[PDB]
Amino acid sequence: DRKLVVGLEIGTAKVAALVGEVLPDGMVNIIGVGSCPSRGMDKGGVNDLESVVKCVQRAIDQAELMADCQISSVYLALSGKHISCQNEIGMVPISEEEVTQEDVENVVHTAKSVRVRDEHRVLHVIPQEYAIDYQEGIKNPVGLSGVRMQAKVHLITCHNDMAKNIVKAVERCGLKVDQLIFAGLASSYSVLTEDERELGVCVVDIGGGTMDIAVYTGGALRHTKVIPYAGNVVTSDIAYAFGTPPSDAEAIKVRHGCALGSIVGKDESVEVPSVGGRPPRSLQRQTLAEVIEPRYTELLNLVNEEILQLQEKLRQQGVKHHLAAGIVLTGGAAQIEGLAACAQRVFHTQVRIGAPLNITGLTDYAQEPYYSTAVGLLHYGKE
Ligand SMILES: Nc1ncnc2c1ncn2[C@@H]1O[C@H](COP(=O)(O)OP(=O)(O)OP(=O)(O)O)[C@@H](O)[C@H]1O
Ligand SMILES: [Mg+2]
Ligand code: NI
Ligand code: NI
Ligand code: NI
């Protein structure tokens, strides 16, 4: 009745710790929500271990109190520039004419047994499709009849050391790390429906530093990618354009920003403190949107031409390649006004801002786009 699951993300602008309770119908009951503005981490990783330990424990302490429980283990969200993916294929004999569960384990281990690059470590082994004698597109093949079976898997890889620092901070707080999970995978478990997965969809988590991408076609995970340019780059463009402190460029962006310059009133204006003991700067909301907008299109175009690069790859191998469900933009930096209409002009398909699904309890606090990554760590963990 009461085996909890805890998800922890040490983001670049936030440290989210959520305690969830899994219910009989698969829905996760959110009973604790902890948060802390991130500290001690720069554009690379950890630059002060004791600094992030303070902020990690602060979020854990907040979640521990809200749920009246004692956290002992977590599912740590992992991201970063050096995440990569591989698509492999295996093959194994359907002995006994009937598919055993051991056969699926054997054929998945066969496909993943390829030669992974030096200094690279396999993080996730996700089967995507099975084939039993000319019949493809199979997801649950156990119990069926056949002679030869082929399996296709998605291999998410990382580096041997790119998570060593954040694992210490969690352990320094007296916590076990149950599993490292790619943020894009966890984000896809929160905002994506199985209807959207079959129809073909791509989920993009726009955080403060990274852009975690996952593309699903035919109900199968086909692509994962991190792009290390997110909300902080938009801020630095505002601080650069108007000569402002980066802390007040982040403030004017959250309160007055807009990724679409066509929907801003002409005479709305916001004051801006300048750098170097110089006076305020009274720009206009539409002019400010004229700086935010082209940064968002350039970022989403980096994602668009990787989808296009993926579709042509999938289209040639006879695999479902069209994204009919569209794009789901989640994450904290996805809450800017006019982003959906702005992202529509880049992908030329339907776009929607996604929030975590299949949760109860404290949805008021957790059903936010900047919680999709850490809520998905709960959805993954209960399996
Ligand atoms: N209303 C808003 N408009 C524009 N940007 C916003 C808004 N609210 C938040 N952001 C941006 O969201 C970013 C942080 O989002 P989020 O909470 O998802 O980050 P994170 O999980 O710490 O980071 P990452 O996923 O990159 O590790 C910041 O860069 C901030 O500027
Ligand atoms: Mg995030
Ligand atoms: Ni590499
Ligand atoms: Ni083997
Ligand atoms: Ni086609």
Residue numbers in the entry: 6 to 388
Provide passages from the article that reported this PDB entry.
During bacterial cell division, filaments of tubulin-like FtsZ form the Z-ring, which is the cytoplasmic scaffold for divisome assembly. In Escherichia coli, actin homologue FtsA anchors the Z-ring to the membrane and recruits divisome components, including bitopic FtsN. In E. coli and many other bacteria, FtsA is the main membrane anchor for the cell division ring, the Z-ring, which initiates and organises division.
The EcFtsA1-405 and XpFtsA1-396 structures showed single protofilaments with a “loose” longitudinal contact between the IIA and IIB subdomains. We noticed that the position of the IC domain is variable within FtsA monomers across FtsA structures.
